[PDB]
């Protein structure tokens, strides 16, 4: 268990993803 679980989040806000590519695949702009 490592490398960012985004399942634990209900959704991931695009605001905290920076330039991370995998974060920008699940993130949601508000």
């Amino acid at each position, epitope marked *: *268990n*490592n*490398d*960012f*679980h985004f*399942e*634990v*989040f*209900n*959704f*991931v*806000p695009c*605001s*905290i*993803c*920076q*330039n*991370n590519p995998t*974060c920008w695949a699940i993130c949601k702009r*508000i």
Partner: antibody, heavy 125, light 107 residues
Framework: QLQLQESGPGLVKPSETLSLTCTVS??????????WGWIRQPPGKGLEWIAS???????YYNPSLRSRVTISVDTSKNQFSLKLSSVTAADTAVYYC?????????????????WGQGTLVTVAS | EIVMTQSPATLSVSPGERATLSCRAS??????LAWYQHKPGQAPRLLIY???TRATGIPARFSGSGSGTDFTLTISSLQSEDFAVYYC????????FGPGTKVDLKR
């Protein structure tokens, strides 16, 4: 300077729900890219994180408590609250509220700075 | 599942010497590791994040080193003020804290 203050019942009957509120002062919760969370420490056990909430309504959950946690933010009164359902003696603890810095950029941030002073909850029949 | 262990559970230290403290992970956490100081009855305080980075307002006598599975927090020139429990916390996937080490003073 940023300060957090928990307030909530010292005593909650088992099989019921425990609710706490953090009142942040010396800084505004909205708008802010910080999550706001609750950590608890049972007597003579380690620290366990519970849940955090972001101004946007995103919620970061510790999976082993998700099913029992409801966490909310009242951006106007500068207050986030925690509700933990169906409590047992396993829930007796000091509950801290904290500012949760989450970031997935070049150097991750996923820590708690600063913290409140804790409030003791007791789950007693 | 990541497991944070710390050693020694407790440590007695002469006023002035250097207390070196250890945190260990089951799997690797890169450098996603922070250290907190918790004096009794007071609020926890973030000492180090990044596993090498002092948080603002923290004396230079506190330093963090290590990576992957082995980290060490060290307090050079220990003061009596410093008596407390120190927890590490990994954040490779989500917040997990170590059991903590109690730092006692000798006199």
């Amino acid at each position: 300077q940023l300060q957090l203050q928990e307030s909530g019942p010292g005593l909650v009957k088992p099989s019921e729900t425990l609710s706490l509120t953090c009142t942040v002062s010396g800084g505004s919760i909205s708008s802010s890219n910080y999550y706001w969370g609750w950590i608890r420490q049972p007597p003579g056990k380690g620290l366990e994180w519970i849940a955090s909430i972001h101004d946007s309504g995103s919620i970061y959950y510790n999976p082993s408590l998700r099913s029992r946690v409801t966490i909310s933010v009242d951006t106007s009164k500068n207050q986030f609250s925690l509700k933990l359902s169906s409590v047992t003696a396993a829930d007796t603890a000091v509950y801290y509220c904290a500012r949760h810095l989450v970031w997935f950029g070049e150097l991750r941030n996923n820590w708690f700075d600063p913290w409140g002073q804790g409030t003791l909850v007791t789950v007693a029949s | 599942e990541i497991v944070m262990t710390q050693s020694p559970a407790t440590l007695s230290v002469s006023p002035g010497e250097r207390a070196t403290l250890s945190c260990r992970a089951s799997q690797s956490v890169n450098s996603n590791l922070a250290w907190y100081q918790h004096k009794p009855g007071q609020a926890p305080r973030l000492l180090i994040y990044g596993a090498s980075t002092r948080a603002t307002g923290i004396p230079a006598r506190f330093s963090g080193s290590g990576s992957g599975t082995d980290f060490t927090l060290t307090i050079s020139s220990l003061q009596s003020e410093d008596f407390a429990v120190y927890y590490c916390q990994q954040y490779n996937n989500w917040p997990l804290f170590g059991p903590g080490t109690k730092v006692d003073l000798k006199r």
